[PDB]
CSV table of C-alpha atoms in Angstrom, one decimal:
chain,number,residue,atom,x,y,z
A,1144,UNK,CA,82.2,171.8,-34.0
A,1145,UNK,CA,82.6,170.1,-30.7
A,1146,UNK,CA,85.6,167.8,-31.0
A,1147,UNK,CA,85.6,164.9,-28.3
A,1148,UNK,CA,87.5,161.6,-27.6
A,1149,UNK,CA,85.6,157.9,-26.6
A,1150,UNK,CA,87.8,156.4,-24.3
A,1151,UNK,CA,86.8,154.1,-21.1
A,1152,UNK,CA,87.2,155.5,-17.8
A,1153,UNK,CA,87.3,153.3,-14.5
A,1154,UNK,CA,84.6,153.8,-12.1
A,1155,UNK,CA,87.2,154.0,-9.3
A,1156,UNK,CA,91.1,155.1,-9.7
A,1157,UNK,CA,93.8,156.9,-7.8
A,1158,UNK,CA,96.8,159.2,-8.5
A,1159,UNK,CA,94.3,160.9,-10.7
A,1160,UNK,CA,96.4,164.4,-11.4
A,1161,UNK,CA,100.4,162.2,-11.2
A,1162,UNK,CA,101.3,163.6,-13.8
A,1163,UNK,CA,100.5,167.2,-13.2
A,1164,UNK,CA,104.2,169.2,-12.1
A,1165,UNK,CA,102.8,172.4,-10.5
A,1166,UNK,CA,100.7,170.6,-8.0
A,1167,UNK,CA,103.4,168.4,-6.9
A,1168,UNK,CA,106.0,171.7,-6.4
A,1169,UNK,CA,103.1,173.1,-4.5
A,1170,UNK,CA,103.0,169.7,-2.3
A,1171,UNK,CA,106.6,170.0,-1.6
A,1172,UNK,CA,106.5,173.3,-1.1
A,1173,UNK,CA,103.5,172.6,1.4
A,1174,UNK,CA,105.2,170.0,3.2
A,1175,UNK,CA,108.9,171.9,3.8
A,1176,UNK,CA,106.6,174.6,5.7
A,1177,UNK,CA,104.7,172.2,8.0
A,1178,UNK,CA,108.1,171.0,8.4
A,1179,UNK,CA,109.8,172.5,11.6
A,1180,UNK,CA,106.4,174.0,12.4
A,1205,UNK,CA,107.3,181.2,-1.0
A,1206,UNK,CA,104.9,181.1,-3.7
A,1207,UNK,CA,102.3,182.9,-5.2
A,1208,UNK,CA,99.7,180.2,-5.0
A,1209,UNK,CA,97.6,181.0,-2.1
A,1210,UNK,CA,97.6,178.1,0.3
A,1211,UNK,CA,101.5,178.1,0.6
A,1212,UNK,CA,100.8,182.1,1.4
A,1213,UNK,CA,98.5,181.1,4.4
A,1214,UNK,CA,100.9,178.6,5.5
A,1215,UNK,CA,104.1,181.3,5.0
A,1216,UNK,CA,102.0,183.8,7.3
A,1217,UNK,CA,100.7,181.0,9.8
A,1218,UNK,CA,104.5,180.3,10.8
A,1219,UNK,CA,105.6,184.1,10.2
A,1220,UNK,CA,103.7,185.2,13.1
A,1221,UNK,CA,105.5,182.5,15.3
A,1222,UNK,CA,107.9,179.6,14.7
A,1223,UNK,CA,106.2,177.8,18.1
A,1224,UNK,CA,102.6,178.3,19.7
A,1225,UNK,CA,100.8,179.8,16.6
A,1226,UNK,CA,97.5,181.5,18.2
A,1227,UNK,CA,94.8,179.7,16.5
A,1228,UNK,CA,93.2,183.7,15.7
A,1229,UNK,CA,96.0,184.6,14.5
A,1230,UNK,CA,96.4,182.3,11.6
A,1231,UNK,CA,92.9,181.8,11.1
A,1232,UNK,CA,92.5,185.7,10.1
A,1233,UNK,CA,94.8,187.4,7.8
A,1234,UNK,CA,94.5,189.6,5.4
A,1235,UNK,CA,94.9,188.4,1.7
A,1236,UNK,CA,92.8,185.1,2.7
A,1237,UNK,CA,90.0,186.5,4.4
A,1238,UNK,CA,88.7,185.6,0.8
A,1239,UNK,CA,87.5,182.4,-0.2
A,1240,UNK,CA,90.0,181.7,-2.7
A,1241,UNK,CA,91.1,178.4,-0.7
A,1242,UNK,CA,88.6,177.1,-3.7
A,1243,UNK,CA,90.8,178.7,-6.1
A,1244,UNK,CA,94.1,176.6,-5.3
A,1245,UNK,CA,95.3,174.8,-7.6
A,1246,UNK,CA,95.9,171.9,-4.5
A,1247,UNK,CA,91.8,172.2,-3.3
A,1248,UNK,CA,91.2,172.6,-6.5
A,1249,UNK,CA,92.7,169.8,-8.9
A,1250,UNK,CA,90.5,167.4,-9.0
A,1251,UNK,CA,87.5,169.7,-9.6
A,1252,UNK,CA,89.3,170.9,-12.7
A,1253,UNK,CA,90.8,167.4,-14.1
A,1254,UNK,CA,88.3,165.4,-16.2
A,1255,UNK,CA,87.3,162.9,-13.3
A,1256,UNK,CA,84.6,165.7,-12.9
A,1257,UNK,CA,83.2,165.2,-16.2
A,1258,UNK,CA,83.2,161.7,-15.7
A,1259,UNK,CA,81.5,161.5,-12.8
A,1260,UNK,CA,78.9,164.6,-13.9
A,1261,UNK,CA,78.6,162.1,-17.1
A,1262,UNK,CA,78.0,158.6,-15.2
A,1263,UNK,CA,75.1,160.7,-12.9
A,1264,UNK,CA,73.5,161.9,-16.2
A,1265,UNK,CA,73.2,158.9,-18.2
A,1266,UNK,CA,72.0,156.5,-15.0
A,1267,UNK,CA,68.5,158.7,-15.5
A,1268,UNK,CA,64.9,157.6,-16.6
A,1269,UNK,CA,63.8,160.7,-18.4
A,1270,UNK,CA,65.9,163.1,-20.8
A,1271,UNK,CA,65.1,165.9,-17.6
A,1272,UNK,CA,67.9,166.7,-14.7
A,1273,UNK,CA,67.2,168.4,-11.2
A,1274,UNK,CA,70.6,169.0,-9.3
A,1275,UNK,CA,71.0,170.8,-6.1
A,1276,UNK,CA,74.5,171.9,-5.0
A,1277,UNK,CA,74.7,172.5,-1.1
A,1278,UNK,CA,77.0,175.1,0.3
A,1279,UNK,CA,77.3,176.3,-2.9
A,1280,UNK,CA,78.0,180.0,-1.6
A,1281,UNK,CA,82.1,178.3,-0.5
A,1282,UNK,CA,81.9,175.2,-2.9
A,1283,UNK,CA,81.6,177.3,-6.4
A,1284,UNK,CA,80.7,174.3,-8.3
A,1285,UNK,CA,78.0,176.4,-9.7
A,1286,UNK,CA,80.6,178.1,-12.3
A,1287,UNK,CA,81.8,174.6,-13.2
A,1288,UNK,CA,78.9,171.9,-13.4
A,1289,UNK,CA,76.7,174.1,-16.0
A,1290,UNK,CA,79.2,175.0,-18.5
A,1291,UNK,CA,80.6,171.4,-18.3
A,1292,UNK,CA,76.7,170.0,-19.5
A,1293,UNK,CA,76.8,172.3,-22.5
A,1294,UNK,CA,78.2,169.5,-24.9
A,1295,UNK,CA,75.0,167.1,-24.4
A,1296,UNK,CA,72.5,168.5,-26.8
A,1297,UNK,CA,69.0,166.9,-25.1
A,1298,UNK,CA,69.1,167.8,-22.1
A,1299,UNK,CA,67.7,170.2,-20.0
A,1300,UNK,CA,68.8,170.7,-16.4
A,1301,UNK,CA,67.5,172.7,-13.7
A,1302,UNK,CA,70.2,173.6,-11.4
A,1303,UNK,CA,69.9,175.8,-8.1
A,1304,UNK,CA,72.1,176.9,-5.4
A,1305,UNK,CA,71.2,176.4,-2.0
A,1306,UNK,CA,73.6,177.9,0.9
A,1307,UNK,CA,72.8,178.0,5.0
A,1308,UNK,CA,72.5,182.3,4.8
A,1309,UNK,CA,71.0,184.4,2.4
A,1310,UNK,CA,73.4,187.1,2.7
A,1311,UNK,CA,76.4,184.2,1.8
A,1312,UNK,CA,77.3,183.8,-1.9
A,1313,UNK,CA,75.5,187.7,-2.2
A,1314,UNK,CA,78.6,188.1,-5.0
A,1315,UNK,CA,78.8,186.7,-8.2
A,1316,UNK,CA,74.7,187.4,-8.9
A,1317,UNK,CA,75.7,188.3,-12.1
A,1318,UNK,CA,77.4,185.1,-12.4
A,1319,UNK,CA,74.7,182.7,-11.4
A,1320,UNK,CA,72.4,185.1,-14.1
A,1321,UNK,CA,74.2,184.1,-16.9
A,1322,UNK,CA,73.9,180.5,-15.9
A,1323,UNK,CA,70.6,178.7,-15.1
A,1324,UNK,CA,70.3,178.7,-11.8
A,1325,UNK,CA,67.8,179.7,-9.1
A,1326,UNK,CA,68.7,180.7,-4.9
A,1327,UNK,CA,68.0,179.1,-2.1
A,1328,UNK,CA,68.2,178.8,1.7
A,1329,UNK,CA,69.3,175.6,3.0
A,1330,UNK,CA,71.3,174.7,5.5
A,1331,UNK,CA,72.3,171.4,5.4
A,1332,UNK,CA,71.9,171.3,9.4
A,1333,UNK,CA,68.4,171.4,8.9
A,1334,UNK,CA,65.9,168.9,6.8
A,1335,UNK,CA,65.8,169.9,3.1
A,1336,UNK,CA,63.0,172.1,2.2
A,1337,UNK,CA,59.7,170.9,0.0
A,1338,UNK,CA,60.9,173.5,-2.8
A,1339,UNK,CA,63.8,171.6,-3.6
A,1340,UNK,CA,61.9,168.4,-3.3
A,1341,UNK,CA,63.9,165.3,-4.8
A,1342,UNK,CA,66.6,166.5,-7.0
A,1343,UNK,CA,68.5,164.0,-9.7
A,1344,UNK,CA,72.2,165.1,-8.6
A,1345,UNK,CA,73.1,166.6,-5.0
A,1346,UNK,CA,76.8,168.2,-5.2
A,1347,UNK,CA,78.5,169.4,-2.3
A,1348,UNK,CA,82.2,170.7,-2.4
A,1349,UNK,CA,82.7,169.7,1.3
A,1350,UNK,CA,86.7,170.8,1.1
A,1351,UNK,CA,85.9,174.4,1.0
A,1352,UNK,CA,82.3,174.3,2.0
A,1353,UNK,CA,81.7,174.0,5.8
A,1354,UNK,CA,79.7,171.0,6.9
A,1355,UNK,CA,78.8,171.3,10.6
A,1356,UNK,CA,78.5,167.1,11.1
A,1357,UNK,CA,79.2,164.1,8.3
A,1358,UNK,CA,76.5,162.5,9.6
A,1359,UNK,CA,73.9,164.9,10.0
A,1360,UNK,CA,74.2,166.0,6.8
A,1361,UNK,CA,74.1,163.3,4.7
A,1362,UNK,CA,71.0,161.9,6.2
A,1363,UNK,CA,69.5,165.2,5.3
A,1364,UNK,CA,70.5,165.8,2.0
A,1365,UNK,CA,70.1,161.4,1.3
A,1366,UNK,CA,66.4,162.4,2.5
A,1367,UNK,CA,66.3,165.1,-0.1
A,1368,UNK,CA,67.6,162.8,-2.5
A,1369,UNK,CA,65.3,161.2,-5.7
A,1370,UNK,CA,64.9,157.4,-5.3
A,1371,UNK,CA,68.1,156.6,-7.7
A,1372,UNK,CA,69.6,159.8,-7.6
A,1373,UNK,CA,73.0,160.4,-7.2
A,1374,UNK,CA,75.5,162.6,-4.1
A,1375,UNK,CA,78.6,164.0,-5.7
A,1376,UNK,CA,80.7,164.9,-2.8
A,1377,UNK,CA,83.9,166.1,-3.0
A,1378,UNK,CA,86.4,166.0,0.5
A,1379,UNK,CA,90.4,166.2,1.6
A,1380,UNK,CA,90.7,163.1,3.2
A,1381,UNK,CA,92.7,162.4,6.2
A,1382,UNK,CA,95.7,160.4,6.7
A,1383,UNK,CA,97.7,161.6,3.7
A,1384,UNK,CA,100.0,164.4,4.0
A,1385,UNK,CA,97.8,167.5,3.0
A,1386,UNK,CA,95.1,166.2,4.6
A,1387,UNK,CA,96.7,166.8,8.1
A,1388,UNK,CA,98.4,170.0,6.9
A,1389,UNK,CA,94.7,171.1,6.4
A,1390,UNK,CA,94.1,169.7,9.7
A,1391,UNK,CA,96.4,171.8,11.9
A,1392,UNK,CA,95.1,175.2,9.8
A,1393,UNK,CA,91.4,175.5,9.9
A,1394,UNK,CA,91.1,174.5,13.6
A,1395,UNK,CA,89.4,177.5,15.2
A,1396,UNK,CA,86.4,176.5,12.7
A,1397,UNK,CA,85.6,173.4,13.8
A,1398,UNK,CA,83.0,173.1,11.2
A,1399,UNK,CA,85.4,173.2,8.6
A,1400,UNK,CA,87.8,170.7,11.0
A,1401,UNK,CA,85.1,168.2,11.1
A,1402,UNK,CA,84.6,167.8,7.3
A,1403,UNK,CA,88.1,166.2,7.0
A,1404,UNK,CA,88.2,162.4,8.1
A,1405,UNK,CA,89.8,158.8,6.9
A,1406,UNK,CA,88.5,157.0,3.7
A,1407,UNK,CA,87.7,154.6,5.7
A,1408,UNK,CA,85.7,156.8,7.8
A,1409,UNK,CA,83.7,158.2,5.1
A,1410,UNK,CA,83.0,154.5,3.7
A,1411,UNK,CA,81.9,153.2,7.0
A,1412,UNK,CA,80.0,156.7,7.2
A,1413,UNK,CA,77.6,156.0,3.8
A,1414,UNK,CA,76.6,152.6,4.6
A,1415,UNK,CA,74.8,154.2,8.1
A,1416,UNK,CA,72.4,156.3,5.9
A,1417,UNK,CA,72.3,153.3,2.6
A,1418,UNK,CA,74.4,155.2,0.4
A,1419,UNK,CA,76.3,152.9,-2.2
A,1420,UNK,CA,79.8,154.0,-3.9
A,1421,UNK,CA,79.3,154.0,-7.2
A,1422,UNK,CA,82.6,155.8,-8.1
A,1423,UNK,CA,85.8,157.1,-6.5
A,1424,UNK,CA,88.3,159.5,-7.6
A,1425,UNK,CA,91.6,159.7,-5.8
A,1426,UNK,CA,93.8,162.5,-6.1
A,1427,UNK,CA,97.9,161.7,-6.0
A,1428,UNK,CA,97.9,164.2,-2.6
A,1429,UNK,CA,94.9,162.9,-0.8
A,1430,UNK,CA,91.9,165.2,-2.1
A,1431,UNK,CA,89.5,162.7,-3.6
A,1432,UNK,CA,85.9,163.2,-5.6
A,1433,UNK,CA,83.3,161.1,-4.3
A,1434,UNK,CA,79.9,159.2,-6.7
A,1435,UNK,CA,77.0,158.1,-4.8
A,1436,UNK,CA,73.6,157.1,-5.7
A,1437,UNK,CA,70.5,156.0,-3.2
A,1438,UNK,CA,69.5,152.0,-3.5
A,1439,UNK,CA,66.5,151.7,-5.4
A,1440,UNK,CA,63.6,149.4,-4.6
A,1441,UNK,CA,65.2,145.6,-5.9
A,1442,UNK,CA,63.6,143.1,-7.9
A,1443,UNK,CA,64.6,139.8,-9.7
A,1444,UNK,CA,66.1,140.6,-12.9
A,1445,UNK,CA,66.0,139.7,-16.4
A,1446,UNK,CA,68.8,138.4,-18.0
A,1447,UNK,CA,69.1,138.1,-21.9
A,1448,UNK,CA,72.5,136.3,-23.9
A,1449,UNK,CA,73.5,139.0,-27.0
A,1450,UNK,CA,76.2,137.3,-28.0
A,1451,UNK,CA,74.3,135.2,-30.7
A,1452,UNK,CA,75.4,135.3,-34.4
A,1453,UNK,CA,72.0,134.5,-35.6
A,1454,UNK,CA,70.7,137.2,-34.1
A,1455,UNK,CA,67.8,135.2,-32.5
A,1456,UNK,CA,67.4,137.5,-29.6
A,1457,UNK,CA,66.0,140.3,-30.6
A,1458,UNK,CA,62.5,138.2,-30.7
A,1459,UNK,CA,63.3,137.9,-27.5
A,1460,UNK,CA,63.9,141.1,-26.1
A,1461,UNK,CA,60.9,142.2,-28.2
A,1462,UNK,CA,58.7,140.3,-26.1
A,1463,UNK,CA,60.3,141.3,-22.5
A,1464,UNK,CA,60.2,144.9,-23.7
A,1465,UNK,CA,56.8,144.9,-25.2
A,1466,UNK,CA,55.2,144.4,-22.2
A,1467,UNK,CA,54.3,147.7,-20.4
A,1468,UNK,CA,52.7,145.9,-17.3
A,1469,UNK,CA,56.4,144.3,-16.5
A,1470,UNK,CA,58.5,147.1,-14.3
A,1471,UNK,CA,61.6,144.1,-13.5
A,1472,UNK,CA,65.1,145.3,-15.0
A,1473,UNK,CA,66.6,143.9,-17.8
A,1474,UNK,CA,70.4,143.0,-18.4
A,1475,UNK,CA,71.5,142.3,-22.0
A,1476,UNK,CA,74.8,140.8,-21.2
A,1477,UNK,CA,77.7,139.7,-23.3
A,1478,UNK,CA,80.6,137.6,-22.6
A,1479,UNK,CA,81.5,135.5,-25.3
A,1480,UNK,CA,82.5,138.5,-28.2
A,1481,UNK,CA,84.1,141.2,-26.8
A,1482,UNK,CA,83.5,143.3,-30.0
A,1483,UNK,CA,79.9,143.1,-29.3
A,1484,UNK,CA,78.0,146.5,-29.8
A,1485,UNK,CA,75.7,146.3,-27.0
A,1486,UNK,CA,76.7,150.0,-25.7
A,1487,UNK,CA,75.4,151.1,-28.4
A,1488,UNK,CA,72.2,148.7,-28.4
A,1489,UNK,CA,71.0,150.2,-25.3
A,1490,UNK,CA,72.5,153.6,-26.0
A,1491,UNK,CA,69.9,153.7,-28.6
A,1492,UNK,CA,66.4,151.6,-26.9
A,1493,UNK,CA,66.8,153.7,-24.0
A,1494,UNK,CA,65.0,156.3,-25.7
A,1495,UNK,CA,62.6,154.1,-26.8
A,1496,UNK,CA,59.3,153.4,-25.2
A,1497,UNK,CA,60.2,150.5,-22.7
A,1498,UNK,CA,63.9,151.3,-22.9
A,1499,UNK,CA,63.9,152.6,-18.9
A,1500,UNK,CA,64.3,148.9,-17.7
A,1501,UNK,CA,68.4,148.4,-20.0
A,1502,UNK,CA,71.0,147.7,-18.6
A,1503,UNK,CA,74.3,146.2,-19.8
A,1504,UNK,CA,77.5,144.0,-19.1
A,1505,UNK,CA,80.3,143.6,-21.3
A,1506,UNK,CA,83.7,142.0,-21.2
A,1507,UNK,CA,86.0,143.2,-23.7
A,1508,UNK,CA,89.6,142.4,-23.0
A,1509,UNK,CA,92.4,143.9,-25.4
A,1510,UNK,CA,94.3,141.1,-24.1
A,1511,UNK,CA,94.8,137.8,-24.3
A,1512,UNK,CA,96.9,137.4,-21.3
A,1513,UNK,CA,94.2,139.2,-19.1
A,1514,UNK,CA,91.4,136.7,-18.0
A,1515,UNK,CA,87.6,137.2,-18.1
A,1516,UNK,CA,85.7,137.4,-15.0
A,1517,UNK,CA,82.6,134.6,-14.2
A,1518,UNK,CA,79.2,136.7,-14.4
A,1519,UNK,CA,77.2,133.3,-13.2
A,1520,UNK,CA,74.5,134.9,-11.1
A,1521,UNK,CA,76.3,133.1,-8.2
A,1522,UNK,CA,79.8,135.1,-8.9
A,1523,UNK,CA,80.3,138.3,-6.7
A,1524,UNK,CA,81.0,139.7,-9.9
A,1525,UNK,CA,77.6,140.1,-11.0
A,1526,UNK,CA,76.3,140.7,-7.6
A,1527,UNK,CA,78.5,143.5,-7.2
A,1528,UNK,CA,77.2,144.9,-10.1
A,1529,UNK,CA,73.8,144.4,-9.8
A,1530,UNK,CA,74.2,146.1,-6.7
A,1531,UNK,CA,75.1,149.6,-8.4
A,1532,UNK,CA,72.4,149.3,-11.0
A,1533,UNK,CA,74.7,151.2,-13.6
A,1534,UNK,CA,73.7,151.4,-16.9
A,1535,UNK,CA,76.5,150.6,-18.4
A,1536,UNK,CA,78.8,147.8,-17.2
A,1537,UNK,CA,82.5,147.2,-18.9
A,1538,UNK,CA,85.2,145.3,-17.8
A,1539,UNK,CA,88.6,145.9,-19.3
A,1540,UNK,CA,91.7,144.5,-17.9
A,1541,UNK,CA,90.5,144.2,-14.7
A,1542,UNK,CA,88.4,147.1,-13.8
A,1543,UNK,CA,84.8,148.2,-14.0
A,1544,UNK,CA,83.8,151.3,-15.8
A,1545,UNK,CA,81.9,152.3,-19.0
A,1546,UNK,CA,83.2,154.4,-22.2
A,1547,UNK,CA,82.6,158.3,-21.9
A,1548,UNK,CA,83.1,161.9,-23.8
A,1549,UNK,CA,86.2,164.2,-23.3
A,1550,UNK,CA,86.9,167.4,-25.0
A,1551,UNK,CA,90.1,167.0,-26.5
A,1552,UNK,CA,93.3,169.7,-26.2
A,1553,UNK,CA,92.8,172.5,-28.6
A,1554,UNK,CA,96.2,172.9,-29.3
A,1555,UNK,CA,97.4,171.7,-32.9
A,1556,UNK,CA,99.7,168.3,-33.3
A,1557,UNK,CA,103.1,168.7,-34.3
A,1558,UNK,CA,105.4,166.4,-35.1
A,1559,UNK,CA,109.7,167.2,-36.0
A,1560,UNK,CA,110.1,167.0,-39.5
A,1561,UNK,CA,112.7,167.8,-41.8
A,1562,UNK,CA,110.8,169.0,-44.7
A,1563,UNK,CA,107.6,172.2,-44.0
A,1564,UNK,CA,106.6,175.1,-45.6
A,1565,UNK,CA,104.9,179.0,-44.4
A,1566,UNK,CA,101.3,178.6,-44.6
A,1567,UNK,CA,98.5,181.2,-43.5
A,1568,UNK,CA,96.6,179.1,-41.2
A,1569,UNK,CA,93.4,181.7,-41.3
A,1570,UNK,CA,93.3,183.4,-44.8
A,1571,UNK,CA,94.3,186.7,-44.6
A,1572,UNK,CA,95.9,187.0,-41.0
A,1573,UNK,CA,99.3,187.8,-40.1
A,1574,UNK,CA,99.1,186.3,-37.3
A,1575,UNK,CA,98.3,183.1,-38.1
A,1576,UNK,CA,101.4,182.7,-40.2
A,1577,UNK,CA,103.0,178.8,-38.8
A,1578,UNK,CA,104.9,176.4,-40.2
A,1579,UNK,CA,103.2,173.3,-41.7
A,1580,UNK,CA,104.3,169.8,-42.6
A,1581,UNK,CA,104.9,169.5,-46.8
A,1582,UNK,CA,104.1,166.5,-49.1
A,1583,UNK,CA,108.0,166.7,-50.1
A,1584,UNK,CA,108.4,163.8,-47.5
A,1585,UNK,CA,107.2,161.8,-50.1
A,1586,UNK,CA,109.6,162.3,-53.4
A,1587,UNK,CA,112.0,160.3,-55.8
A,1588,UNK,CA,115.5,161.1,-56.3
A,1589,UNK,CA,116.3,159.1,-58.9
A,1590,UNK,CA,114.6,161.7,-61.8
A,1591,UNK,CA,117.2,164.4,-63.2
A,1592,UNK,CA,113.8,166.1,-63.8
A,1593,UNK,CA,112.9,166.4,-60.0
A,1594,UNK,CA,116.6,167.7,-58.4
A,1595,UNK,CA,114.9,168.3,-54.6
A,1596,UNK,CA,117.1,171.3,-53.2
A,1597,UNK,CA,117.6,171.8,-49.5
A,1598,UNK,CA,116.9,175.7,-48.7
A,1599,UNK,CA,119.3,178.1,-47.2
A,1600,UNK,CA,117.8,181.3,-47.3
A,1601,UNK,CA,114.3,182.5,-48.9
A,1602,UNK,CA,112.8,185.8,-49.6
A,1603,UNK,CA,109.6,187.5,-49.8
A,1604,UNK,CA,108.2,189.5,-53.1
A,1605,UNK,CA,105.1,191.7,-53.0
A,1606,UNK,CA,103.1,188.5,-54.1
A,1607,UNK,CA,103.6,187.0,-50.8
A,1608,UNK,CA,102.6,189.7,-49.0
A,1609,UNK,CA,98.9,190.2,-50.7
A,1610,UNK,CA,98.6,186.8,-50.9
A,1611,UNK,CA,99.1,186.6,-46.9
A,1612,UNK,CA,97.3,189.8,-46.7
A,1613,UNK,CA,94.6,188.4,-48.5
């Protein structure tokens, strides 16, 4: 079985991977090397070798080439690499997917030869069971991303030949999702290439992008390295910068990840055509609305959205409400809003049409819609660890977890916990030493 927790996530938070120890050594590590101009973790190797060849007036050629990261394992760096790997991915792979009319999904990762999103986004998908996606991997060169054929086989995925520079070919067409790795992927211009790909983008779509800002401490480490590329240089810039940036080609901010360090994972999606909206109260005990939505949903002429909004109970199930219509006929025009406070203390936001609130919100034309203690962001599915519980306990007995292997043998928490002392009958004995007849060993054996 696939095992998985329900737990809301904000739309927007930072210090994502705080808790994470490796990547903060591998910050300070960073930082002491920049430091008056170590590890086996590549970046701090580059770094090493970037001040080995001189402590004062690096050549730029010099530390650009070097052998041991003439590959492109900048990707595979823990630091370029954390958020990628932490489950802000999965949320933001999980708020594109649901935000879609049909059951179908057409995503297009650019510079995927350097990005290597392409071994991540389709194994991450495998949990939802309806749907089908059509993913393909479209790079400025052919000969680029020529390894790992074999890879992109056993996933479903097609080539391609784009380079962002250029407009987006007719074969791709409008694509659902458009993910770009910009940190290790090389984008010639910000600009440039976000009014291409925004053109190749579905109306409603969504632009994962994924960049080392500026201002914060890697980010300008990255910025001295990487210089003779200027490509590369140009990718990094202020958040800010890349704020101001999206409005110029009508790009709305859906969701933002931001790392502890500075690298931050970026949610997009392209304004759709507006309209006045419906709004329907579900907060009714008598249940009395459902005649209502009945009628606002029956009609197939009406294309207007439809917001089933709750504020009164915040145990309402509306999630699940439209969870469920959406795959009914009609069901493309649901969308929700729900307060649910786990505190008293906390207040409840005004969602009057005339509050920001609801503008704000009406304005990212999310799905789903939950506020709780003051932040945005809707419930989603995480794989939980593998790894058994375990808890210290005084009282535990050998048990064969898998029948019949050896190796398998742990120790297991025993119903002892629970006895009387108080019956001469019972006479619980604490155990020093026990031993092992034949009968143990074919019963482990099986």
């Amino acid at each position: 079985p696939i095992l998985e927790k329900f737990c809301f996530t904000p739309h927007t938070e930072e210090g994502c991977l705080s808790e994470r120890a490796a990547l903060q050594e591998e910050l300070q590590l960073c930082k002491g090397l920049v430091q008056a101009l170590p590890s086996q973790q590549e970046l701090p190797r580059l770094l090493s070798a970037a001040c080995r060849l001189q402590l004062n007036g690096n050549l730029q050629l010099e530390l650009a080439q070097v052998l041991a990261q003439e590959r492109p394992k900048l990707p595979e760096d823990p630091l370029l690499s954390g958020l990628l790997d932490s489950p802000a991915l999965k949320a933001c792979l999980d708020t594109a997917v649901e935000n879609m009319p049909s059951l179908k999904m057409k995503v297009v990762e650019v510079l995927a030869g350097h990005g290597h999103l392409y071994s991540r986004i389709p194994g991450l998908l495998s949990p939802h069971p309806l749907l089908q996606l059509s993913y393909t991997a479209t790079d400025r060169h052919p000969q680029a991303l020529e390894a790992a054929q074999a890879e992109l086989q056993q996933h479903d995925v097609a080539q391609g030949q784009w380079d962002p520079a250029d407009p987006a070919p007719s074969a791709l067409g409008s694509a659902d999702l458009l993910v770009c790795n910009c940190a290790v992927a090389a984008l010639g211009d910000p600009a440039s290439a976000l009014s291409n790909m925004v053109a190749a983008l579905r109306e409603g779509g969504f632009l994962l992008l994924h960049t080392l800002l500026r201002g914060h401490p890697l980010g300008d480490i990255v910025a001295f390295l990487t210089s003779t590329e200027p490509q590369y240089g140009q990718g990094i810039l202020s958040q800010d910068a890349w704020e101001s940036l999206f409005s110029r080609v009508s790009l709305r901010l859906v969701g933002l990840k931001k790392s502890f360090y500075g690298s931050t994972l970026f949610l997009c999606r392209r304004p759709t055509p507006q309209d006045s909206p419906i709004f329907l109260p579900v907060d009714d005990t008598s249940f009395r609305w459902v005649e209502s939505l009945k009628g606002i949903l029956a009609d197939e002429d009406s294309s207007r959205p439809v917001w089933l909004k709750a504020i009164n109970c915040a145990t309402s199930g509306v999630v699940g409400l439209v969870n469920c219509l959406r795959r009914e006929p009609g069901g493309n025009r649901l969308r929700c809003v729900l307060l649910s406070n786990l505190s008293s203390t906390s207040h409840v936001p005004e969602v009057d049409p005339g509050s920001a609130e609801l503008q704000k919100v009406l304005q990212g034309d999310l799905v789903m819609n939950v506020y709780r203690d003051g932040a945005w962001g809707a419930f989603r599915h995480f794989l939980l660890e593998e790894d058994k519980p375990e808890e210290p306990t005084a009282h535990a007995f050998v048990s064969t977890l898998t029948r019949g292997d050896l190796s398998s043998i742990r120790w297991v928490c025993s119903s002892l916990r629970h006895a009387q002392p108080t019956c001469p009958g019972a006479q619980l004995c604490t155990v020093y030493y026990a031993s092992l007849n034949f009968r143990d060993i074919m019963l482990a054996t099986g």
